[PDB]
Amino acid sequence: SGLKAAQKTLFPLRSIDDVVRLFAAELGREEPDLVLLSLVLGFVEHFLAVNRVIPTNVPELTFQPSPAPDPPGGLTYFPVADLSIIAALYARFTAQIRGAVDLSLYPREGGVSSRELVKKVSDVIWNSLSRSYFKDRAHIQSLFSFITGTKLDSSGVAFAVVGACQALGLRDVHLALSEDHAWVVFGPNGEQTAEVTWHGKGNEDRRGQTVNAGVAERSWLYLKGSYMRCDRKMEVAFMVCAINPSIDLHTDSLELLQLQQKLLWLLYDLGHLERYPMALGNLADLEELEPTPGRPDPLTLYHKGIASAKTYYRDEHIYPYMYLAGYHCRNRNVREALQAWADTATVIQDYNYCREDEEIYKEFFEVANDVIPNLLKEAASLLEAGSALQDPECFAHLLRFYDGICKWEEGSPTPVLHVGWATFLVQSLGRFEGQVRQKVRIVSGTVAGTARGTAQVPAGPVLTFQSEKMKGMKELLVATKINSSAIKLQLTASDYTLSFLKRQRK
Q: Segment Interaction with FANCD2: which positions?
């Protein structure tokens, strides 16, 4: 088809504000052009982060200078996204897709695409790209990468399928997002799902399949069915969060940061981040790096993220709580950090650890074994050298945190806790004096619910464990003497109920 005239006249883009304008315009439509926006984002990220050296051998390429930030001062050069280049890339991508699929062969009765169609488009992309199989590569998430070097990362593939479908007028094909995976949803009620990309290694054979098995097995990868079903607006939010300001391991592009930041505020003001917890979290991190005059504080944004997850996703997301806890950790608010992690543990306790949940495992491991120990160790110095370590609450949160992780392990095909965890649990316990640890009351319930007629409640922060392991050692944890050996042992390792339920009834 080509670019509409209203689209061609937004170019050239000479600044961060110009890019923001392109997005505003596109966000103003019923069907914002995902291909055009991704190409632009990839193009700009390429010269700002991937290869910053101004090519003097290339004339068509121009660079718009503007004042750098002060006090540093100087000049910063922005890569001018020329219409001739962007339109070329846009035509190339559109050509590949349109020529590859014959919409004549596909009868879409109603505004609904068939699974065969989606798999066809999926296949077109899959056979076009080339993976960086042996090497982790950054900046290959955009369609700019796809159409230029052919490279595409995991989630980049999923996005490309949706962009491709839109380029064919498949208005019902949307991106599905978990916290570490992406697929496609389509059809009536947008209730059909198709895997289009890979996760981990040796799992390419999953493409084409439905997502049910993943949802059913309760892996974190599929969020127990509470994953994100995007619309066009959220898909724009996705590609914006997908911007990677990293130039190297320890260096970031200021403009990519500012661009991402301004773009997320645009999306916020329009109400498109309402159902996007990680995006809210992303914005908070940026507001923490470079606060913007007049905008809500990070703490407020993180809480919006958790609110979104609770409202729209049955409070089944982990990261929103992880983000908050990270903030409190970075500012030495121990009680707050501990509480947020406790909350995080509470959400994960109802999942089942699978080999493809490695990403969220790493995070928990790092919290229990690195971040918490250091925080507790730090607090110990503030004590003896003249407090969290003297508050039964914080010790309860700690216990609740481990309880959830233990609960997570139950019913999981793969063991979670090992020697590496036990060592630090023991060390973390000790950091609390028996006097404090004993003020916490561990106990099971005796009576369910409360009566009324007024309200009658049947009978130190009382605590109740959900996991087998944590209550199996309720006594040890509270003793004045930490039985290091015992704890480390426990921390690692029938229609009865039905027929019983009858006996209570008959």
A: 214-386
The DSSP letter of residue 77 is: E
Whole-angstrom distance, CA of residue 502 vs CA of residue 506: 6
Q: How far is CA 41 from the centre of its chain?
A: 20
Please list the alpha-helical segments (H only) found in 349-433.
Answer: 358-366, 372-384, 392-409, 419-430
DSSP state of 297: P
CA gyration radius, the chain: 26
Q: How far, in Å, CA of 369 to CA of 266, rounded?
A: 39
Question: How distant, in Å, are the alpha carbons of 142, 174, 247, 319 from that of 243?
Answer: 9, 20, 12, 18
- The three-class DSSP label of residue 388 is helix
Residue type, 227: Y
Separation of alpha carbons 253 and 248, rounded Å: 9
- For 301-314, give the DSSP string: HHHHHHHHHHHHST
How determined?
X-ray
CA distance linking residue 118 with residue 160, whole number of Å: 12
In sequence order, what are the residues at sequence separation of 6 or more whose Cβ sits closer than 8 angstroms to the Cβ of residue 398?
A: 338, 342, 372, 428, 429, 432
Resolution in A: 2.5
Residue recorded with tokens 């170019």 = 11
**Helix, strand or coil, per DSSP, at residue 128:** helix
Q: Where are the alpha helices (DSSP H) in 168-318?
A: 212-216, 232-241, 254-269, 277-289, 298-312
d(CA 157, CA 140): 10
Bridge partners, 176 (sequence order): 183, 229
Q: What is the DSSP letter of 295?
A: P
**Could you give the CA distance from residue 409 to residue 153 in angstroms, rounded to a whole number?**
30
d(CA 143, CA 152): 8
